[PDB]
Design a protein around this nucleic acid. Structure first.
Length: 97
DNA sequence: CTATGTAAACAAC
DNA sequence: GTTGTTTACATAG
């Protein structure tokens, strides 16, 4: 990573799409195909944990929310939320076990 | 303390 | 296995 974060990158892939929504697979594709850094799924396929990491960021903060299709199958798109308003602390971890 | 990055133990598939 | 969460620890600043 030259300058940016996983958090940001994801929010970025999801930013420039024909229509706003992406999917892990699709997100994963962005990563592997853009910015020399990731190489995993490209022509060949899969290196370790970044796979697991991206899932973390997405599910964790406040810019990403998930949307499925009510129907029989798997349309889970990752979109962005709350832009007009800003404020809202995110329980920044450690109370405890 | 805070944000980032990881590694991994898991509820549903 | 895949997707989604959520503990937990590691730093760097």
């Amino acid at each position: 990573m030259g300058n940016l974060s996983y958090a940001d990158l994801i929010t970025r892939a999801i930013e420039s799409s024909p229509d706003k929504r992406l999917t892990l697979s699709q997100i994963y594709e962005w990563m592997v195909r853009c910015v020399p850094y990731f190489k995993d799924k490209g022509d060949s396929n899969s290196s370790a944990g970044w796979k697991n990491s991206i899932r973390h960021n997405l599910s964790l903060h406040s810019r990403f929310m998930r949307v499925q299709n009510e129907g029989t199958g798997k349309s889970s798109w990752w979109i962005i939320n709350p832009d007009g308003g800003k404020s809202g602390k995110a329980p920044r971890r450690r109370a405890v076990s």
